[PDB]
Design an enzyme around this catalytic site. Structure first.
Site, PDB file in Angstrom:
ATOM      1  N   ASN A 100       0.826  -1.219   0.000  1.00 21.95           N
ATOM      2  CA  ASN A 100       0.000   0.000   0.000  1.00 21.95           C
ATOM      3  C   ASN A 100       0.852   1.257   0.000  1.00 21.95           C
ATOM      4  O   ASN A 100       0.409   2.307  -0.488  1.00 21.95           O
ATOM      5  CB  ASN A 100      -0.880   0.030   1.270  1.00 21.95           C
ATOM      6  CG  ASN A 100      -1.575   1.332   1.497  1.00 21.95           C
ATOM      7  OD1 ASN A 100      -2.509   1.685   0.777  1.00 21.95           O
ATOM      8  ND2 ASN A 100      -1.156   2.062   2.533  1.00 21.95           N
ATOM      9  N   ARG A 158      -8.229   5.159   1.986  1.00 23.85           N
ATOM     10  CA  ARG A 158      -7.543   4.516   0.867  1.00 23.85           C
ATOM     11  C   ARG A 158      -6.581   5.431   0.088  1.00 23.85           C
ATOM     12  O   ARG A 158      -5.539   4.960  -0.398  1.00 23.85           O
ATOM     13  CB  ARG A 158      -8.574   4.013  -0.159  1.00 23.85           C
ATOM     14  CG  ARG A 158      -9.139   2.637   0.198  1.00 23.85           C
ATOM     15  CD  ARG A 158      -9.898   2.587   1.526  1.00 23.85           C
ATOM     16  NE  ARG A 158     -10.658   1.339   1.600  1.00 23.85           N
ATOM     17  CZ  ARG A 158     -11.917   1.189   1.192  1.00 23.85           C
ATOM     18  NH1 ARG A 158     -12.583   2.212   0.665  1.00 23.85           N
ATOM     19  NH2 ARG A 158     -12.471  -0.017   1.207  1.00 23.85           N
ATOM     20  N   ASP A 167       1.736   6.960   0.265  1.00 21.10           N
ATOM     21  CA  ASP A 167       0.696   6.110  -0.302  1.00 21.10           C
ATOM     22  C   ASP A 167       0.806   5.898  -1.813  1.00 21.10           C
ATOM     23  O   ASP A 167       0.666   6.858  -2.575  1.00 21.10           O
ATOM     24  CB  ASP A 167      -0.674   6.710   0.072  1.00 21.10           C
ATOM     25  CG  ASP A 167      -1.745   5.705   0.169  1.00 21.10           C
ATOM     26  OD1 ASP A 167      -1.636   4.772   0.995  1.00 21.10           O
ATOM     27  OD2 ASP A 167      -2.741   5.825  -0.572  1.00 21.10           O
ATOM     28  N   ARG A 195       0.206 -12.405   2.661  1.00 23.26           N
ATOM     29  CA  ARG A 195      -0.553 -11.621   3.608  1.00 23.26           C
ATOM     30  C   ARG A 195      -0.523 -10.217   2.985  1.00 23.26           C
ATOM     31  O   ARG A 195       0.588  -9.703   2.768  1.00 23.26           O
ATOM     32  CB  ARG A 195       0.167 -11.586   4.971  1.00 23.26           C
ATOM     33  CG  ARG A 195      -0.462 -10.539   5.920  1.00 23.26           C
ATOM     34  CD  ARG A 195       0.494 -10.251   7.093  1.00 23.26           C
ATOM     35  NE  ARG A 195      -0.079  -9.363   8.107  1.00 23.26           N
ATOM     36  CZ  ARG A 195       0.113  -8.048   8.187  1.00 23.26           C
ATOM     37  NH1 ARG A 195       0.887  -7.411   7.316  1.00 23.26           N
ATOM     38  NH2 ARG A 195      -0.468  -7.362   9.163  1.00 23.26           N
ATOM     39  N   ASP A 197      -0.605  -6.708   3.524  1.00 21.53           N
ATOM     40  CA  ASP A 197      -0.541  -5.720   4.587  1.00 21.53           C
ATOM     41  C   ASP A 197      -1.397  -4.486   4.314  1.00 21.53           C
ATOM     42  O   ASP A 197      -1.520  -4.109   3.149  1.00 21.53           O
ATOM     43  CB  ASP A 197       0.927  -5.306   4.774  1.00 21.53           C
ATOM     44  CG  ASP A 197       1.113  -4.242   5.770  1.00 21.53           C
ATOM     45  OD1 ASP A 197       0.957  -4.513   6.978  1.00 21.53           O
ATOM     46  OD2 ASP A 197       1.434  -3.106   5.365  1.00 21.53           O
ATOM     47  N   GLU A 233      -5.049  -8.209   5.180  1.00 18.33           N
ATOM     48  CA  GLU A 233      -5.091  -7.653   6.533  1.00 18.33           C
ATOM     49  C   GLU A 233      -6.043  -6.472   6.583  1.00 18.33           C
ATOM     50  O   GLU A 233      -5.646  -5.342   6.259  1.00 18.33           O
ATOM     51  CB  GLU A 233      -3.678  -7.201   6.993  1.00 18.33           C
ATOM     52  CG  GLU A 233      -3.680  -6.823   8.512  1.00 18.33           C
ATOM     53  CD  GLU A 233      -3.071  -5.495   8.840  1.00 18.33           C
ATOM     54  OE1 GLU A 233      -2.692  -4.712   7.937  1.00 18.33           O
ATOM     55  OE2 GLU A 233      -2.968  -5.182  10.047  1.00 18.33           O
ATOM     56  N   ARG A 337      -3.883 -19.270  12.064  1.00 19.28           N
ATOM     57  CA  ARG A 337      -2.507 -18.805  12.053  1.00 19.28           C
ATOM     58  C   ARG A 337      -2.001 -18.726  13.493  1.00 19.28           C
ATOM     59  O   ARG A 337      -2.601 -18.002  14.311  1.00 19.28           O
ATOM     60  CB  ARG A 337      -2.407 -17.421  11.385  1.00 19.28           C
ATOM     61  CG  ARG A 337      -0.953 -16.913  11.379  1.00 19.28           C
ATOM     62  CD  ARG A 337      -0.847 -15.506  10.747  1.00 19.28           C
ATOM     63  NE  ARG A 337      -1.597 -14.511  11.517  1.00 19.28           N
ATOM     64  CZ  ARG A 337      -1.914 -13.297  11.075  1.00 19.28           C
ATOM     65  NH1 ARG A 337      -1.565 -12.916   9.852  1.00 19.28           N
ATOM     66  NH2 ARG A 337      -2.634 -12.484  11.837  1.00 19.28           N
TER      67      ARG A 337
HETATM   68  O1  LIG Z   1       6.411   2.539  10.915  1.00 21.92           O
HETATM   69  C1  LIG Z   1       5.208   2.403  11.083  1.00 21.92           C
HETATM   70  C2  LIG Z   1       4.505   1.384  10.441  1.00 21.92           C
HETATM   71  O2  LIG Z   1       5.129   0.628   9.499  1.00 21.92           O
HETATM   72  C3  LIG Z   1       3.178   1.174  10.779  1.00 21.92           C
HETATM   73  C4  LIG Z   1       2.345   0.373   9.994  1.00 21.92           C
HETATM   74  C5  LIG Z   1       1.062   0.093  10.442  1.00 21.92           C
HETATM   75  C6  LIG Z   1       0.223  -0.720   9.684  1.00 21.92           C
HETATM   76  O3  LIG Z   1      -1.040  -0.988  10.124  1.00 21.92           O
HETATM   77  C7  LIG Z   1       0.673  -1.247   8.486  1.00 21.92           C
HETATM   78  O4  LIG Z   1      -0.145  -2.063   7.755  1.00 21.92           O
HETATM   79  C8  LIG Z   1       1.949  -0.965   8.036  1.00 21.92           C
HETATM   80  O5  LIG Z   1       2.393  -1.480   6.852  1.00 21.92           O
HETATM   81  C9  LIG Z   1       2.792  -0.152   8.789  1.00 21.92           C
HETATM   82  O6  LIG Z   1       2.662   1.700  11.922  1.00 21.92           O
HETATM   83  C10 LIG Z   1       3.193   2.907  12.266  1.00 21.92           C
HETATM   84  C11 LIG Z   1       2.424   3.788  13.033  1.00 21.92           C
HETATM   85  C12 LIG Z   1       2.965   4.987  13.458  1.00 21.92           C
HETATM   86  O7  LIG Z   1       2.211   5.844  14.201  1.00 21.92           O
HETATM   87  C13 LIG Z   1       4.278   5.322  13.127  1.00 21.92           C
HETATM   88  C14 LIG Z   1       5.041   4.449  12.362  1.00 21.92           C
HETATM   89  O8  LIG Z   1       6.323   4.770  12.045  1.00 21.92           O
HETATM   90  C15 LIG Z   1       4.489   3.246  11.931  1.00 21.92           C
HETATM   91 CA   LIG Z   2      -3.680   3.615   0.133  1.00 22.86          CA
HETATM   92 CL   LIG Z   3      -2.369  -9.845  10.318  1.00 23.00          CL
END
Ligand SMILES: O=c1c(O)c(-c2cc(O)c(O)c(O)c2)oc2cc(O)cc(O)c12
Ligand SMILES: [Ca+2]
Ligand SMILES: [Cl-]
Ligand SMILES: *[C@@H]1O[C@H](CO)[C@@H](O)[C@H](O)[C@H]1NC(C)=O
Length: 496
Positions: A100, A158, A167, A195, A197, A233, A337
């Site tokens: 993403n 999104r 993004d 998975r 993310d 996820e 899992r």
């Molecule tokens: O570094 C970070 C990070 O990677 C993620 C993250 C959360 C998700 O839910 C994802 O799906 C994902 O790919 C990354 O959380 C964060 C939240 C923060 O406030 C600050 C961050 O630095 C991160």
């Molecule tokens: Ca997005």
């Molecule tokens: Cl998960």
């Protein structure tokens, strides 16, 4: 995309969180294969930002720099070696695909990355994966900050940056193609699925367009036409416009309500009781079983401030955790899992863990190898929940009762419950503050069965509790509320 692609009879995957590829390869051969594990979820195998203020936090792996298979877990040669060795023993590999976004917009430009690739978040320049400002949603996002601000607006969730993470413009064929190029490199190496993310932050249609560019699994190991297993996820606890059902046409979805509610039930929060679990599954408002990826905890929420909050049970709550994992592995709902973690200096301050950022055990940033102790547990601060007798034996229980119906449910109106899986398995739980001593209908053939929670079936004998099933299918179960593990599980393959 809904089938796990594990061998027939293998019904679970284990998340070997932050493990190095060489250690997973060895684990496949020495334990996962003989113990019946279906596969392994690996941490993101693509190059990420090397973060040094908090020293090498686990979350740095969710901030991509490129799609080169070069991380603290190992290089491309080590990754390929692991996939080949695991597939050669019938244990699959599932990749955590961070697609993403790229890294945080405020991360400094330079070569502070796991493979030394140059990158400049400020100018949207990721030359190692030809990505430029044209490949991000900066001009599409409508919020004043450029970040996600309100989850009641499904568009913003999104098209805007998740906590500042750049993004990707997933509507663009070029971006979809660079992501598919990465995922197809992994599929051709031998991975069985992914998975996805941050799926809630991607449009269902953009995910579908990417999945449509993916190859079928490598035909040297998998039957022709095998589609990669996809589990998205999506964090959906019911209070927002985005529903995980919008993603059913792409593959399975993580059911975060599962671990959240199993945690409140086992912790007995707000009067909840195990007797309420008779209709567990869709009856509790969950997604269809054939679209669910279930788990008690995951790498993020086991830290306390994720999907489910403080109700989530983890290895820190060992006794209740084994019971929750046991109930999950015995119940037919979803594809399971199992979590496998590392220990960190958890330090609670004002209700929150200030050390929740700590990365895997390491020596000056280099991840420690997983050592195996003579008693089959792990050293070097690796928890190895999947090696706990009570969990490993329930992973086998799920395999033994595969396809078997949920039946013979019993409950005392409080926290003493039991149920079987056709004529192949039976499990009994006592989460009340008093003993459980009663004869129950098990649905199993007569004989002597070893309880696989308190012991094992070794050399035709039981090392722990023994259950005697009579010709009527009934058996007496005794579980004190002070027993190490307040639950008993028996199955066809634990019969003497
Ligand atoms: O570094 C970070 C990070 O990677 C993620 C993250 C959360 C998700 O839910 C994802 O799906 C994902 O790919 C990354 O959380 C964060 C939240 C923060 O406030 C600050 C961050 O630095 C991160
Ligand atoms: Ca997005
Ligand atoms: Cl998960
Ligand atoms: C069961 O255990 C006893 C020792 O307690 C041993 O004598 C016996 O041989 C075992 N049974 C089998 C079938 O190995």
């Amino acid at each position: 995309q809904y089938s796990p692609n594990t061998q027939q009879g293998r019904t679970s995957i284990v998340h070997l969180f932050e493990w190095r590829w060489v250690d997973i390869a060895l684990e496949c051969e020495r334990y996962l294969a003989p113990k019946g594990f279906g596969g392994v979820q690996v941490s993101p195998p693509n190059e990420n930002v090397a973060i040094y203020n908090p020293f090498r936090p686990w979350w740095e792996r969710y901030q991509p720099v490129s799609y080169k298979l070069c991380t603290r877990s190992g290089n491309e040669d080590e990754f390929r070696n692991m996939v080949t060795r695991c597939n050669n023993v019938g244990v699959r590999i599932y990749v955590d695909a961070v697609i993403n976004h790229m890294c945080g917009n405020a991360v400094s430009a330079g070569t502070s990355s796991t493979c030394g690739s140059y990158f400049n978040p400020g100018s949207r320049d990721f030359p190692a994966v030809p990505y430029s400002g044209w490949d991000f949603n900066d001009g599409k996002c409508k919020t004043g900050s450029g970040d996600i601000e309100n989850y009641n607006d499904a568009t913003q969730v999104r098209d805007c940056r998740l906590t500042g993470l750049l993004d990707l413009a997933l509507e663009k064929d070029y971006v979809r193609s660079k992501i598919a190029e990465y995922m197809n490199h992994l599929i051709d190496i031998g991975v069985a699925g992914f998975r996805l993310d941050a799926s809630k932050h991607m449009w269902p249609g953009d995910i579908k367009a990417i999945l449509d560019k993916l190859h079928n699994l490598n035909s040297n190991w998998f039957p022709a036409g095998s589609k990669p297993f996809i589990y998205q996820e999506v964090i959906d606890l019911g209070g927002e416009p985005i529903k995980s059902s919008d993603y059913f046409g792409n593959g399975r979805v993580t059911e975060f309500k599962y671990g959240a509610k199993l945690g409140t039930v086992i912790r007995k929060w707000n009067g909840e009781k195990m007797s309420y679990l008779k209709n567990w599954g869709e009856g509790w408002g969950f997604v269809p079983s054939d679209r669910a990826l279930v788990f008690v905890d995951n790498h993020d929420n086991q830290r306390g401030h994720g999907a489910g909050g403080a109700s989530i049970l983890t290895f820190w709550d060992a006794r209740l955790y084994k019971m929750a994992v046991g109930f999950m592995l015995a119940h037919p709902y979803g594809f399971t899992r199992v979590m496998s973690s590392y220990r960190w200096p958890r330090q609670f301050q004002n209700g929150n863990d200030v050390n929740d950022w700590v990365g895997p055990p390491n020596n000056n940033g280099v991840i420690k190898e997983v050592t195996i102790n003579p008693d089959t547990t792990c050293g070097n601060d690796w928890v190895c929940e999947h090696r706990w007798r009570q969990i490993r034996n329930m992973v086998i229980f799920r395999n033994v009762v595969d396809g078997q119906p949920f039946t013979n449910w019993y409950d005392n109106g409080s926290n003493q419950v039991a149920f079987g899986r056709g004529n192949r398995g039976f499990i009994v739980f006592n989460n009340d503050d008093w003993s459980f001593s009663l004869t129950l209908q098990t649905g199993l053939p007569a004989g002597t069965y070893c309880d696989v929670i308190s012991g094992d079936k070794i050399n035709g004998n039981c090392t722990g509790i023994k259950i005697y099933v009579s010709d009527d299918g009934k058996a007496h179960f005794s579980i004190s509320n002070s027993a190490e593990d307040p639950f008993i599980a028996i199955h066809a393959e634990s019969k003497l």
